[PDB]
Structures are given as C-alpha cells and as structure tokens.
Amino acid sequence: EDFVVTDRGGIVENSHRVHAAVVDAKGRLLYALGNPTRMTLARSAAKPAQALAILETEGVAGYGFDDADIALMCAAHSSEDRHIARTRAMLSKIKAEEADLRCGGHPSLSEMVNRSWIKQDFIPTAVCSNCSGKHVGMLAGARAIGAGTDGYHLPDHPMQGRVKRTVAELCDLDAGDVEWGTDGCNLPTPAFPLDRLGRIYAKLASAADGSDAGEGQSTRCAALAHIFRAMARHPEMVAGEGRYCTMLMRAFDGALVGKLGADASYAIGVRASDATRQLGTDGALGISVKIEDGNLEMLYAVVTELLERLGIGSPDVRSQLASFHHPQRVNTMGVTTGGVSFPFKLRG
Amino acid sequence: EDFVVTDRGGIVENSHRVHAAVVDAKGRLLYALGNPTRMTLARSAAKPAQALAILETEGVAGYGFDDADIALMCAAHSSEDRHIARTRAMLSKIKAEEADLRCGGHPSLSEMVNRSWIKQDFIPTAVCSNCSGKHVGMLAGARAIGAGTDGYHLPDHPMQGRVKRTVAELCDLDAGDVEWGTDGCNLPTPAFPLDRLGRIYAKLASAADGSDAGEGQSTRCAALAHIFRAMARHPEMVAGEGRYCTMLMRAFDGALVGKLGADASYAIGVRASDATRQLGTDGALGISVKIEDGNLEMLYAVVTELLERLGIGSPDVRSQLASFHHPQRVNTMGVTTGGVSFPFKLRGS
Ligand SMILES: [Zn+2]
Ligand SMILES: [Zn+2]
C-alpha cells in the first residue's frame, strides 16, 4: 500500500508502487517501504562497486587517475563536452583509443544536451556513453593485469570475474544470490535484494567516516573512502548540470553521496550525523529505493520526500531540490492542474 | 492482480498494473483485467463525446465540416503540417482566428515531428495543439447558438454545460457520478469508471453498424455513426504517421476505431464481426484500458496483446503492430537484453 500518486484536480491520474530500505553500516534494516528485499537490477547504481573492482586491480594505481576520473567511473553522466573530454583524457592515460571501448552511444541522459544533439543531427559514439568512465577503468584494469583488452566486457574476462566477486562481497551475499543480466552499455549488470544496495552505500559512507577520523583502514575500506570523496568532490562528473544526483550532492556538501540506476532505482550513502543518530544508529546509513514501474520523475520526488521524513539535511539544504520533490503540473496555458502526493508510511 | 512485466535476462525490471474492460453495446461487462470500474480520467479518449456535443449543437451543420474535419475534432494529432493546415481551414469555416483559441502549444506527440521543430527552433502556438480540432469545434458550437466565443472553454459557458451533460448521457451516469478536472489544453476533462469509457466506444461502433444496416436512428445515433465513420476514414487526422492509433486503424480498415488518452488510457470501438460473435455478443464491442502508472510503451503492448487474446483481427492484420506488441529491448551495441511479458488471464463473465 506504499504509493506515490499524481492527481488532476484531486482525481487520481497515475499511481506508482514504492519500495525502499534504510539500513545501517552492517546492513541491518532500520526502516522500509513496500518490499525492502525486492530482487532489483541495480543498473548504474552498481557503479561504486564496479569502480572498487577497478581500483583494487593491481597496477591501476600506476595510471594516475585523479578524483575526477574516479567520479566519472562512478558516473551516469549527461555526455556533456567535459565528460567526453575527460573520457578521452583517461583513454590517453592508459594509451588506448576510442575504438577499444565496447560500450555504445545513446541519446543523452540530459534533455537539454540531447536537444542540442538533435538540433545538430549528432550521432553519439562509444566515447559519449554515460558509462564511458566505467569502461575506461575496465580497460585500464584489463591492461594492468596483462589479460588482453579485447573482451574486457565479457563475463569470462578476469575483469568481469573481479566485478562479480566484488559485488557479492560488498553485498555480503553468496555468488548464487546475485543474478546477472546485460546493461545498456553491454557489461554484465547485477541484481540483488534492494536492501543490499543500501548496504553497499552504507559501506561507502562508513568508510568515508573512518578515513576522515584517521582510523586504520584495510585496503578495501581506504578505496571505498576514496570513491565516496571522489563522488562528493566532483558530483558534476557523476551526472551533470541540472541532474538530480549532481544537485543532491552539491546541496549536501559532502554529507552524503547519491546515485541513479536506470528504470528508477536510487541509492544514498549517509555519513554518520545527528540525523542518523536520531534514527537510532551509531554509524553511517544507507538508503535504497525502487519505483516498481520505472518512472524517474516519481523516483526523484520519492527520494526527496524520504530524506525529509528521515530528517536528513535541513529544510534549506533540501529546498535546493524543491522542483524534484513537488514536480510542476502546469498545462499549456500556465494553469496548475494537479500535483504529486505521497500516500506511503515508513515502517520500523 | 494483472501486470505487464519487463525483464532483463529474465530478471524482472519493471512491472505495470493493467486495468481493462471489454463491454457489449449496452455496456455489459464481458471480459476484464485489473479493476474494470476504476475511476479514470479519459483525457483525449473522451474526444468523441466532446465531438458529439459539438455536432449536436444547433446550427453547427451550417459550417460544412467534412469527415476529415470531424476526425480532427476527435484527434490527438501529431501537429504535422497537414493537421495545422486543417485547423486553419476549420477556423476559416467558422470565421474565427487563432487568437480565439484557448488551448496552448506543446511539444509534438510525435518524436519525429518534434525533431524537425527543434532543428527549426520552432515554438508551437495554439493552432499546433493536439486538441486544436476539438477547440475549433467548440468555438463553432459557441458561435452557432450565439453564446459568444469568449470563455467557450469555461465550465459556466453553455458549450461546456452541453459537453458535461453529453458525457454523462453517453456513459449512462448521473451528473454527480462524473468528476471533472482541467486538461492540458485547458478544457474541462471528465473522469468516470473505466468500463464506461468502453461503453462510449461500443456505442460508436454500434451506431455505425446500425447506420450501415439502414436502421431507424435518432439524431444522436446518426451522429455517433458519423463520428465513427469520420475516424475510420481519416485515421491520419486522429493521430499521424507512425502513431499507434493511425497504424491500428489502417490495419483494421474500418472494422474498429481506437484512440489514446494521455497518461496511458486507450479505447476501441469494434464493429460486429465473426470475432465479436465468438466473444459472446450479438452486437458491437467496446474495449478500454488504463496502465496504472501511465507508461505509453506498455499501453500499446498491452492493447495489442489484448486484441490477440480476443481474436480481433487476423494474425496477419495484427503483425502490422508487432513493433508495439513486443517493444524492442536491444542495447547500445545491438544485443537483445530483455523483453516484455503478459502474465495475466483475461477474466470472462
Ligand atoms: Zn553501464
Ligand atoms: Zn484536450
């Protein structure tokens, strides 16, 4: 019975089923909407796990990827010129070429960018892929271990072996409880219970907390903390101008990281704060969300509403997101015709 | 309940709740999915009832609207140049101007038309509205009874009083059982049980059957028959090139009319046929569908699946709709990554 709803003049137009998990740094379930263990394709929200697989590949350190490169590895970017430029710069660092990519072009995730492409009849290529940074990192990993760069995207390649292991490990799942399909960018892509997506991001944030504190860290926790700080420092690489993820991460100014998955999943890693303590946990927090029918506009409204209900942020921080929280319903003559409502109830 | 489901490598991606009603010519429920009486905003799918109100307005006959004009009154067109052109020619027939329209421009319902507008930096205006034909019809009726064109779109104008009474009468509902919001084109827009949307379209097809067969008809049934005929004859006016509605109606070549409502409603009126007799009725049939979350891609897939389940059309006729039936699920490198499935059973009365 957990829904987000749009109305016209009080009459229900559409309704969308919501699933959400709120977990602690061990993955213990604190709050939920809908079915918080729903088997769910993480899509682009898996990218911090895939970036960890890259950064844990021996020899990748020698290429000198910077924080903005790492953020782009974690990106579903808008294919802005700066994303394309950074993709080529990362290819140059590993002495590869666009022709070595195994992802393909697609209409930009930004409406404003895609409008400019349409105006020019532009044909996007591999380098414009929203996943281009993850693909450059996977090439780098393939080149670093000496495996061969053709086939780096294939499930029998050792780089995909590393990804599959790393995802199960962060999720704390046996390999048999993670399912695999193929993504738009033509990499294997994982599916696992929705709460475990929150667990991954809770572990990002927890690692960021330990790094910031000066605590001793395993090589994996060090790398997670690096991923968090890269995303939070360069949120415009993770998505782009006007994008929810970018506006979300700039508003919060290092307190959390957040990421979209295609077909309306979302994941947030919250560093330990007054808010998380108020929720009843002594460490970092993870949040995962899926809109059952895949509608992105409703995803962003639900994620902002959930941050409000969880007390994360302040009204002024969250207010930067106001156009997503309450999407505009204006007709062709400027008349408001209805709006969005949140008939769901968090359960503990 | 009843879902259309999309997968990626067999892993469930999205699922969409389906509502559908199959009704006979008197509105008796024959088959259903979901909640067949769901209160639903009919949106553009109510436009034949709005057309009926226009055509029943005293004196509208004197403008000489033709079959393609009536089709455009029933349309959610793609704002192709011919749709705009017919809108202006209809303004001319009633001696009105673009400045009289109270609908506004919007991005074209056709991705291909919208590509050309972006390239040309084109800003759509009132004459480009997908509802433009409806709005010229309502100007016409307003002027035909001397009620004035100013405010023709407002609930207190007698043309809108005529629309509201007419919607309830076609649905066979009391006035309080129809709810009203405001549409994207800035007209009043009705909400009523989904099966009643099927009833409107069954009444369309039924009247066309009666008209073809030479039966005595009231002015209203004669007018429903003209509406069906105008839509079936000019499916390109009702939508446009490449649009589901147009391709559907062309494939069936007069046997049915079909129309989209925004946020994924759909309605079909089916003329009496071997298919409909096999479904247990002696007359015409009406179908209405709503995808709960509003997804258009899923709507067209479900409607086409539902035609196959009902045996409506030859399997050869329906293969013209294959690309809508099972939408493409291929990635940026040409690899098929998933599909759509229909794990529901149509429940019969
Ligand atoms: Zn990808
Ligand atoms: Zn309209």
Residue numbers in the entry:
A (entry chain B): 5 to 352
B (entry chain A): 5 to 353
The authors write:
The ReAV enzyme from Rhizobium etli, a representative of Class 3 L-asparaginases, is sequentially and structurally different from other known L-asparaginases. Asparaginases (EC 3.5.1.1) catalyze the hydrolysis of L-asparagine, generating L-aspartate and ammonia. ReAV is a homodimeric protein, with each subunit containing a highly specific zinc-binding site created by two cysteines, a lysine, and a water molecule. Two Ser-Lys tandems (Ser48-Lys51, Ser80-Lys263) are located in the close proximity of the metal binding site, with Ser48 hypothesized to be the catalytic nucleophile.
The introduction of alanine at position 80 resulted in minor structural rearrangements of the protein in the active site area, which were nearly identical in the four protein chains. The S80A substitution affected the hydration pattern of Ser48, which is no longer surrounded by the triad of closely spaced water molecules. The Oγ atom of Ser48 is H-bonded to the Nζ atom of Lys51 and two water molecules, resembling two water molecules of the typical “triangle”. The Nζ atom of Lys263 is no longer able to interact with the Oγ atom of Ser80, but it continues to form H-bonds with the neighboring water molecule and the carbonyl oxygen of Leu264. The fully occupied Zn2+ binding site is conserved in the mutant structure. As observed in the S48A and K51A mutants, a sulfate ion from the crystallization solution is located at full occupancy near the metal binding site, forming H-bonds with the Nη atom of Arg47 and the main-chain N atoms of Gly188 and Cys189, as well as with several water molecules, one of which belongs to the metal coordination sphere. The side chain of Cys249 is most likely oxidized and was modeled as cysteinesulfinic acid. Another serine residue, namely Ser80 from the second Ser-Lys tandem, is an important hub for the H-bond network in the active site, interacting inter alia with the Ser48 nucleophile, to the point of forcing a non-planar configuration of the Ala79-Ser80 peptide bond. The S80A mutation turned the protein activity off, as the proton shuttling network could not function properly. Furthermore, the mutation led to protein aggregation, suggesting an additional role of Ser80 in maintaining the structural integrity of the protein.
